Amino acid sequence: IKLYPLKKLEIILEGAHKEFATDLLDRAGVKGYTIVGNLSGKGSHGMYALIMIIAAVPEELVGPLLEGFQPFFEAHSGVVFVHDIQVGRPIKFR
Amino acid sequence: IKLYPLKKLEIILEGAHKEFATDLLDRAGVKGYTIVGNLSGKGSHGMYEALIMIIAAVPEELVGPLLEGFQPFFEAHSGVVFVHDIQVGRP
Amino acid sequence: AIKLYPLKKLEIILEGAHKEFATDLLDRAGVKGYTIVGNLSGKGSHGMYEGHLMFNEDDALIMIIAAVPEELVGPLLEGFQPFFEAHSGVVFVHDIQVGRPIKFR
Numbered sequence A: 001i002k003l004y005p006l007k008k009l010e011i012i013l014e015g016a017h018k019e020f021a022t023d024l025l026d027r028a029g030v031k032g033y034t035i036v037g038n039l040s041g042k043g044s045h046g047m048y049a050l051i052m053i054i055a056a057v058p059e060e061l062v063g064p065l066l067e068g069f070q071p072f073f074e075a076h077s078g079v080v081f082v083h084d085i086q087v088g089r090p091i092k093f094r
Numbered sequence B: 001i002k003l004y005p006l007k008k009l010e011i012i013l014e015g016a017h018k019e020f021a022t023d024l025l026d027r028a029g030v031k032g033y034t035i036v037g038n039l040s041g042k043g044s045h046g047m048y049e050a051l052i053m054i055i056a057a058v059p060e061e062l063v064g065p066l067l068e069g070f071q072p073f074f075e076a077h078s079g080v081v082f083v084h085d086i087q088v089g090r091p
Numbered sequence C: 001a002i003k004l005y006p007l008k009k010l011e012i013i014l015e016g017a018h019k020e021f022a023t024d025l026l027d028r029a030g031v032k033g034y035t036i037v038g039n040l041s042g043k044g045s046h047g048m049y050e051g052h053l054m055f056n057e058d059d060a061l062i063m064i065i066a067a068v069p070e071e072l073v074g075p076l077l078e079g080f081q082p083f084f085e086a087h088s089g090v091v092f093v094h095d096i097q098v099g100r101p102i103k104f105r
């Protein structure tokens, strides 16, 4: 048929660390991302400028990408949600 | 890194009830949530051009108790709940 | 206690000027509701889209979220394909669960 599997990350972190995260995605070969701005939240270290970066990636990049974010996330607020998704043309993503 | 299974709720409802919702999350033991504002949308009850969406990763055991706590509210107020399967990293 | 049923959830990301095109497609197919996240930014094959820089707010990127029965995913993607051959954007299909199928089907 017509659908092909991919992975989708939801990366939630402080707005001030946007450049870090996008440069990390770019580096890794991720071909695109979408940024939801002006979010609020609650977590360990209190409540809430938070943003959410959405990135559709081939499964081959999840491992590498989480390794990249781990060091950041040991010293900073935030989280990464990995989702399974399907797309009609995975071309655009690899 | 090791990947572990979790559930992710997306809870869309009128911002006037944000407090009710976050409180409910807090008392059920939800360790965190993220909120998206200034939303617009279409539902059985017409157009919205406000709305908010609450994102909450939680362990599977919490989903059932959470839906039951929201049931009274959603059987008398606009809004929807979407349950996703997600994975999260743990090193 | 609350039973859960499968659906699909689409995330459709495109420039705000085409919002009516995309929602019309949803209405036509029988989609019963949708939620729109506005004022987004993004990097794409074409370049960068920065919501905050647009003079008309309605022109910025948006993301339409639509929970739909799996039967409507084909008819919808067939409609969005030619649009996305000619215009910026992407569609992500998710599996989700909901407690009230009647609200969506």
Ligand SMILES: Nc1ncnc2c1ncn2[C@@H]1O[C@H](COP(=O)(O)O)[C@@H](O)[C@H]1O
Binding pocket: A012, A013, A040, A041, A042, A043, A044, A045, A046, A047, A048, A050, A076, A077, A078, A079, B031, B032, B033, B034, B035, B055, B056, B057, B058
């Ligand atoms: N379980 C969760 N669900 C949704 N968002 C979360 C969750 N945990 C953390 N976040 C987001 O990440 C931010 C920081 O969390 P923390 O790293 O725990 O301080 C929170 O303010 C939320 O916006």
Ligand SMILES: Nc1ncnc2c1ncn2[C@@H]1O[C@H](COP(=O)(O)O)[C@@H](O)[C@H]1O
Binding pocket: B012, B040, B041, B042, B043, B044, B045, B046, B047, B048, B051, B077, B078, B079, B080, C032, C033, C034, C035, C036, C065, C066, C067, C068, C104
């Ligand atoms: N199928 C759907 N997909 C995404 N969002 C929805 C859907 N149905 C309802 N919503 C959201 O929930 C709000 C309230 O809808 P309702 O509960 O039908 O009045 C709408 O304005 C939308 O933002």
Ligand SMILES: Nc1ncnc2c1ncn2[C@@H]1O[C@H](COP(=O)(O)O)[C@@H](O)[C@H]1O
Binding pocket: A031, A032, A033, A034, A035, A054, A055, A056, A057, A093, C013, C041, C042, C043, C044, C045, C046, C047, C048, C049, C061, C087, C088, C089, C090
């Ligand atoms: N891999 C991806 N993950 C998340 N969002 C994307 C991705 N590729 C493209 N987008 C979004 O789609 C917009 C247009 O993409 P394009 O059609 O390649 O210009 C971008 O500005 C992003 O907001």
Ligand SMILES: [Cl-]
Binding pocket: B079, B080, B081, B082, C098, C099, C100, C103
């Ligand atoms: Cl619902």
